[PDB]
Amino acid sequence: SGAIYVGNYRVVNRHLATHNDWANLVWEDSSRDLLVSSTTAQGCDTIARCDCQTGVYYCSSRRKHYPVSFSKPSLIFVEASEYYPARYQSHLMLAVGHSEPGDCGGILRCQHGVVGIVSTGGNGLVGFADVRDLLWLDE
Numbered sequence: 001s002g003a004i005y006v007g008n009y010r011v012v013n014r015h016l017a018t019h020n021d022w023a024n025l026v027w028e029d030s031s032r033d034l035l036v037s038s039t040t041a042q043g044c045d046t047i048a049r050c051d052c053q054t055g056v057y058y059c060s061s062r063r064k065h066y067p068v069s070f071s072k073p074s075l076i077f078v079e080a081s082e083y084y085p086a087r088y089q090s091h092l093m094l095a096v097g098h099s100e101p102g103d104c105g106g107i108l109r110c111q112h113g114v115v116g117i118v119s120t121g122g123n124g125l126v127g128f129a130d131v132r133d134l135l136w137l138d139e
Ligand SMILES: NC(=O)[C@H]1CCCN(C(=O)Nc2cccc3c2S(=O)(=O)CCC3)C1
Pocket: 015, 033, 078, 081, 083, 084, 089, 099, 100, 101, 102, 103, 104, 119, 120, 121, 122, 123
């Protein structure tokens, strides 16, 4: 679990979004596993605006942060679940690292701010949904 709070927005994995998230829906994209809902309280997370390929993510299944090198956002394949049919997923970045289902939502950050959130895992790889292109989160 986990979310990014920036301005009056809350960014979560679309597969983990709550009823309250869907009732205050701003935008969602099933192909990116992202959902953004509106909030009443002001958020203070800073979103990175960069092409960094190194950063640190939080891994709840180890209560630890790990430094990683990660790929550029791209279209990658993902197997089925109670949540999605087998399909690709866009704006996804992979890194070599530990992840488990409950790890989705963990933040990946670089020196510039928040880069994205854990969205996929398996086979010793972890995948992050990128949020750096969502320029409207800041306005
Ligand atoms: N973005 C997606 O389509 C997600 C939706 C939830 C299911 N998906 C996952 O990758 N889950 C997940 C997350 C992190 C680590 C692991 C897993 S697992 O594949 O369920 C088992 C291996 C460890 C795809």
